[PDB]
Amino acid sequence: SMEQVAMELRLTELTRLLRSVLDQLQDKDPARIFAQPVSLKEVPDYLDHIKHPMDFATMRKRLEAQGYKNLHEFEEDFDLIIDNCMKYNARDTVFYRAAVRLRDQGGVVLRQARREVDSIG
C-alpha cells in the first residue's frame, strides 16, 4: 500500500537523522571507551553485573537494519551505555569519568535531536 510506503519513508528519514545523532555522540567519546561491547574474554563475570550490555557498535548495527522506530528507543540504548558503565566502574576510574562526560555532552545533542524529530515529524 501507499500508506506502508509512506511509513517506510518516515522510518528511513528517522534512520538518517539517528545516524547523524550517533556520529555526534560518538565524537564525545574520543578515547573509544564505548565503541565496542565489553569483551567476555577480558571481563568474564560482566553479565553477572550488567543485564543489558550496550555499546556504539551494537547501536550502529541496530540502526542500519532500521531497527529504531522512534528517538525514545535510541535514547534508551544510549542511556544503557552510560548507566552500565557507571554501575560496573567506580567513581575514581577513567571509565566512569568518560561516561559522565559523554552524558553531559550528549545531553546537548539529544536536546536538539528531540526538537528535530518532533519538528520534522
UniProtKB/Swiss-Prot annotation:
Cellular localisation: Nucleus; Chromosome
Domain Bromo: 9-113
Tissue specificity comment: Highly expressed in testis.
Cross-link (Glycyl lysine isopeptide (Lys-Gly) (interchain with G-Cter in SUMO2)), chain numbering: 41
Complexes and interactors: Component of some HBO1 complex composed of KAT7/HBO1, MEAF6, ING4 and BRD1/BRPF2. Component of the MOZ/MORF complex composed at least of ING5, KAT6A, KAT6B, MEAF6 and one of BRPF1, BRD1/BRPF2 and BRPF3. Interacts (via PHD-type zinc finger domain) with unmodified histone H3. Interacts (via PWWP domain) with dimethylated and trimethylated 'Lys-79' on histone H3.
Functional description taken from the UniProt entry: Scaffold subunit of various histone acetyltransferase (HAT) complexes, such as the MOZ/MORF and HBO1 complexes, that acts as a regulator of hematopoiesis. Plays a key role in HBO1 complex by directing KAT7/HBO1 specificity towards histone H3 'Lys-14' acetylation (H3K14ac), thereby promoting erythroid differentiation.
Record protein name field: Bromodomain-containing protein 1
Lineage of producing organism: Eukaryota, Metazoa, Chordata, Craniata, Vertebrata
Gene: BRD1
Residue span relative to the full protein: 555 to 674 of 1058
